Amino acid sequence: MFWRIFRLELRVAFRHSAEIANPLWFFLIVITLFPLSIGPEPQLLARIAPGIIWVAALLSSLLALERLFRDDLQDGSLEQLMLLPLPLPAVVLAKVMAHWMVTGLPLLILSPLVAMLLGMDVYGWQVMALTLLLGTPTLGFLGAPGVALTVGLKRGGVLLSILVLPLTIPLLIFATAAMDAASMHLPVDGYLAILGALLAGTATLSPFATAAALRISIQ
């Protein structure tokens, strides 16, 4: 029944399709803001591009995190998902996987456009697409405790950022280190191995600590 929840969340996401583009439009806003401040200089932008790309990715996923749980509290669907005959770790895993398929895949297909806007080569696009693929699920799994904790609040938009971003600091460092090594044309296999290790660890541990937070917030 774990797949029925995932397929239904995909159906509700795909019904009004428009709203899933707003994370990538915000991502493109944040890509736009830095060269306006810095300048049009292509060497400085070529060096600074990992910082822009990953701060934009963190903020775009973070603002997209509201759709992960804020809908089902008001509709009452979150309660009924909690009393499904399934352990709530699996329900949380299904919601985070659907959220990655609705918020991380838009960034992964938008990846050629941002790779052409800043100026990275085809190796840079390959490493950034692979690192986005290994990192945006980790954004989902670190954001899920914060959303589960701050779904009861009316004003939970700044607080969710404050909780999530220090958790995403290690992924930030390894992702930007991977693409700093990629810009100098080095093999980035080890950095992707650490990225996959963090992905596996957070994917294992985050449903079990998001389920408890979600039980706390509803009651």
């Binding site: 009004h16 709203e19 583009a21 306006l36 300048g39 049009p40 100026g119």
Partner: protein, 241 residues
């Protein structure tokens, strides 16, 4: 007079109905003549060579991607003072067309700047201003969609159309000053040799006609979307057959 009768939604439906075909075929004729007299039967620039043909696919796609927005203000203004709902539907009618024209302007500008600059996207003032215009179109569309009630969504869209229009000279001149400060640009948008000019003007007028056709047809789409229960649609659909 009949201008007051231009507010009844079924009457606007048949007026748009008989202005789609003739304006559409006129658009096809004018734009076909413009491109056939521009991408051939025409010289080339001395410095840029045979890459000047892009100045067709960009410049009606640039100017009208502002012009639609300017016309949008008019509709939004009619939405705010006289409380005309159909002008607020016209805003939502023209928002995707303006967004697509802006995307075309960006894509043709990048494809033009590659054989000169060497890369697809140098942060030029023109392309950056077009990108901000695209962002404003996305904002208007997302407001029109994220709301449930269509009427109040149109009123909301009209409000941000007017906000964007008031802030639009400031953004354009601030971006032009941004390129003034850092590093200059070449003569790209409207630095045109004579006798390559009338195909461009013909393509501009053809893009105007195509935008008017697409506007006048999505207006019918939105009018059918709201009046889905009133009996005039029933009489129309029983007339269908």
């Amino acid at each position: 007079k009949t201008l007051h009768q231009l507010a009844i939604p079924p009457r606007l439906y048949q007026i748009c109905g008989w202005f789609i075909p003739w304006l559409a075929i006129a658009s096809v004729v004018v734009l076909t003549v413009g491109w056939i007299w521009g991408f051939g039967f025409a010289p080339a620039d001395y410095q840029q060579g045979n890459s000047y043909r892009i100045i067709y696919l960009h410049v009606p796609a640039a100017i009208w991607s502002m012009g639609i927005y300017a016309s949008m203000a008019v509709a939004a203004f009619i939405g705010l003072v006289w409380q005309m709902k159909m002008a607020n539907l016209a805003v939502a009618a023209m928002a995707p067309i303006g967004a697509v024209f802006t995307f075309i302007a960006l894509v043709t500008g990048s494809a033009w700047g590659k054989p000169m600059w060497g890369t697809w996207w140098v942060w030029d003032a023109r392309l950056t201003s077009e990108l901000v215009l695209l962002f404003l179109y996305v904002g208007v569309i997302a407001l029109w969609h994220a709301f449930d009630d269509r009427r109040l969504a149109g009123r909301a869209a009209g409000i941000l159309v007017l906000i964007g229009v008031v802030n639009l000279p400031i953004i354009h001149y601030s971006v032009e000053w941004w390129n003034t400060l850092h590093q200059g640009s070449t003569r790209m948008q409207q630095s045109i040799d004579p006798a390559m000019r009338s195909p461009l003007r013909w393509s501009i007028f053809g893009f105007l006609l195509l935008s008017a056709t697409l506007t006048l047809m999505r207006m019918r789409n939105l009018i059918l979307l709201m009046e889905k229960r009133r009996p005039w649609v029933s009489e129309l659909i029983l007339k269908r057959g």
